[model samples]
Target: EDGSARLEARTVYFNRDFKREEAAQGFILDLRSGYTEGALGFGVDTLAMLGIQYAKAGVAGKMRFSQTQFRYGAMLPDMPLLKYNDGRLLPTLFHGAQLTSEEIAGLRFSATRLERYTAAQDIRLHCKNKRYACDTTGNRFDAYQLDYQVNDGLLLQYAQGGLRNVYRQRYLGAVGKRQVGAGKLSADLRWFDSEDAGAARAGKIDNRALSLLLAYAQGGHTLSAGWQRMNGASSMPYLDGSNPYLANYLQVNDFANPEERSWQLRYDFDLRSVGVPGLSFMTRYVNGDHIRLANGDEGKEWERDIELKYIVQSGRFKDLSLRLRNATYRTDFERSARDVDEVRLIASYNLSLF
Candidate 1:
């Protein structure tokens, strides 16, 4: 082996005005070490991070500040909930640990625990509005996962974990299986159960869901379909401030809710199949019904999405990539909502050292 221990770090500074908070700064540290040979080799992983703000919310305003802490002072200021009350300056820190095991049958299993202490709950993409404070208390977690190749044409996986009293999740799925001309076929089925234990998200235990996916690829074209059902009494929980059950479970259109059911179909094409490598496009449509509701409303809804992505290859910037995504969502038989259109852009790069 010709790999040596490595170290790298960076930080991000944030400045924005949302008709609320004015200026803010965040510090980040990403560090990892490779282990020396031999069984039970030892190494360390760390994320030393901090955040600070300089200005606070004002009168007739929504955000309220108290002793270096920011709270959701009011609603109706930031629709969809994205900031704090009093718009005060902010500060916080974070740390974590990880462990791993040698590869087994083409797979590696690992576990990790993290501690994130921020003066305020991150305001990126949260749905709560002036309802709670930003904090974490012994909100510890445990997780275990594996990546393995069951055979030449089949793959298997299993993952399960607990995150404080708020929620817990488990999953099992597979890939790389097909029937002759089934054309790049793969399937996945997953089940999740969680409940409220005090977590702002994924803090409920009365929720359970199962999802099934099937896809077929032939030529430059691919088609996929999915079916999901929620048969519990609570809402699905999310960590990292985001949901991960499926590609289409957006907060604007979650097909996973008590007694809710959903289905979706999608298509994709790779221009490279015809000569243009590194460029591809995709589109999808989804709809759901039988949504749980008060007074037996039985909500119904639908969504449509389109996305395009490109990757640069063979140059000093090889593997540098960009992606754009757009989506529209609408619902019916429910008393809330307006048609919504959303778009996102992502740019990234990768470096390998060995």
Candidate 2:
């Protein structure tokens, strides 16, 4: 049959303890198929992710042409602008068409047109005084991205994405790494400009965001610091389920309120250097201030997250990964956004069947 098939399985147990305590367990399956042998290859992929009462399934057709590829139907794209959120028990997907090309050296280009998505999110707000009305985004979303790598240490990116009659966003990013002080130092910079588009379905939006991060890694130890700022009339607006690329995007909070300024401190340690092969831990804290709330009072928010992971390095479960995540979020706004204490446990593995 000149094709290959593989299966991926994921298990998740998630719980959040706020005023209302909710918990759920999920089991998901994904089938990945390789293309046929020819000048133009074709394949199909399927996804079935479930947990009792709630279930979602999707299928997609894929085609390849030389160095370019195309996919139509159910998609979980991971682009700078149109990314899928996998934070929950079940990941989200969309009905879209995507074209990706990497024909040029050290360069990749991607174009996407999304019709709709299968996910959960809030309706847009039409604010007047302290009250609000429900509005929605347009039916279509479009995006284009270009990434170029310079040598082996630096990369540059430019991208634009828009939700029809909602908002248009442009992004510029640069990432670089260098060997310094017997370790490696990395720099990441991001800038975004957003405005209302078409009929302005989401209302008038004028925003600019800038974020920067610096990290240093030495053997089993890595430390990072970041700063992020938002300037404009409205808050940061992105795809419904996708998180922003801001420096202060943590497990529990995005720190993307209007006129918000945030800072982050993070640390990571690897047990592989000491003994255990695939054990690692990461922890980070973020604080945001000067958030313009509904009643024109400045609000403050903070989040702390810790994650520990272990991978089966040389057992029958070889590449199986198990992880535990804990987070706390607190906000001093006019209610609604409550203080949350959350935890998630995950296990994932893949198997091949030819």
Candidate 3:
């Protein structure tokens, strides 16, 4: 096939209110290239990234085969275990080598080895702490994942990884969906086990995380409920500044403190069914308790989030999207936590650059 490319321009306005009001607006550009022609096609990609409060850019590359691909250098990866944070004007990037294969029907495999990359503005690649010293030369991150579709309504997944001297992690997950009368019922369950890896540079890391969610959908209305538990000596660790695949990973909180237990209730509405095409609304509340603190005190926290979004379905503005996000977060850990209200306004559009 012939090579192709496109450009995505995203603009975001972010605001947070805590002790004071903080705000910024910026634009981000993503340039993606289609695979070149050949048995083992090659191509280069780049990110004309973000300019803080203002515009910015980067570069990367990839290679592809029939149903398999190998991408290296700097890139934006969207795996469940190490997801880029698109909450801000610019999403995160990673310097790494990744391989994905789907040659077999109903199954997909992926592996990655990441060294470092930019996160918002930070480039450090070590474990997720400022207190511990990290190694750039001796330490690296690696992960592998497998996803299988057992049937039309059932899926299974497994993933494992380690950050040298940081932590070793494993994940297991399953998702099932069924049509129940006029409504659809779905269930998602996930588990994670993690421990200190070679040299234990990030201290004695040990964690067991689990999350389960059940959802029902009828007409344009969807409702969900979930519980998440974190049992370990420390907090659940994921890629630095990335979103966890937990069911309770809300806009403001992940509820992943050590020995923490949390629950969530969420609702979503699709306005298309009501004649308002390309519009949607979502809201959720999550509460966590039994948090183990370093001071031998139990901590508690809660968050509420609401989102309204719309996209242009036709006309010159076709595919243009606008979103509003609102969140409220509160915690009992006074020294480390505070009550805050956050809002994000995002506008985005894509252009073909063939």
Candidate 4:
């Protein structure tokens, strides 16, 4: 009598036009279950997905206990350096095993080994991108992370990861928030260092990325500003199809080009504060320059994005949500860059079957 289950359904449409116009629509289903009773409980998880104008899906299993858990098989992964990119219709997932412990007050630790992944846009397994492919390089990855809450207002984190024969990366970050006057002020800082590893299948890799974001939130409004710098011969390297958690990870670009520096300004408002319950809006702009390209040309780019979201607060469709996102991107990289316009529409719902 120790089990639970639920299903989530999602529908999405995406369009981008620049050199050429591309559009796609799809649906996704996620099934999850509660662990069975035992000192060490066990469970299973699955994702049965489909896309119109496209096609496909897959599944996995897990285990757990007291403040610590051991997980195996398919899992969604997120970190300051790597995260499942959910910007698309489906979330990317990894095939791996992880051990995590949170038994110590204010401190948490995790170690993971991942072998393969399925991209959000495709249902194929690969060590990295299909072009690079898992079989071509030894497809094994290892990572470790630690998080500590210094107090109610401060937190610190560190992580390191290695992709066999490809690259090694390390991250350090801090976040702090304090109540100031009628608003809350917060600061976030992140740093990353990466280098070539083993045989260096992808060739010489050396990069350093630093990002900082500062913000203030009062009532239902939040305003933020951020800066990011990339220093290295290569662009900021990260798991393919996964979004880096850098402050400048915008709608059309990551602002992570080699030797690039970027700045951002953003604002958000909750319509409920203005008597329109279940509605919210967000907009942001980012500009990047000093980009170093393989051809030795310095480059520049800019992007602007706006999003509107609403949820059915109550009724037969309670909790149903709709989101619309729009973006414009322009760059001076010639062949590699184009002025583009993009739009996305999404609808999602969750159901429980117990």
lDDT of 2: 0.81
Worst 10 residues of 3 by lDDT: 120-129
lDDT comparison, 2 vs 3, better candidate: 2
**lDDT by residue for model 3 over 195-226, one digit each (tens)?**
87887766677889999999999999999999
Report the C-alpha displacement of residue 45, candidate 4, in angstroms: 2.5
Query: What RMSD does each model have against the real structure?
Result: 11.6, 3.3, 2.9, 3.4
TM-score of 4: 0.90
Poorest stretch of ten by lDDT in candidate 1 = 74-83
In candidate 4 the C-alpha lDDT for residue 108 amounts to: 93
lDDT tens readout by residue for model 2, 179-221:
9979999999998899888888767888899899999999999
Which ranges of candidate 1 are over 4 A from the true structure?
1-33, 37-95, 102-109, 117-138, 145-149, 196-204, 250-252, 294-296, 313-318, 333-338, 350-354
Q: Write the per-residue lDDT of candidate 4 for residues 156-272, one digit (tens) a residue.
A: 999998777778899999999999989999999999998878887765778899999999999999999999999988676677657778999888788888899999999999988
- List residue ranges in candidate 3 displaced over 4 A: 1-4, 22-25, 53-56, 120-138
TM-score of each: 0.66, 0.90, 0.90, 0.90
Tell me the TM-score of model 1: 0.66
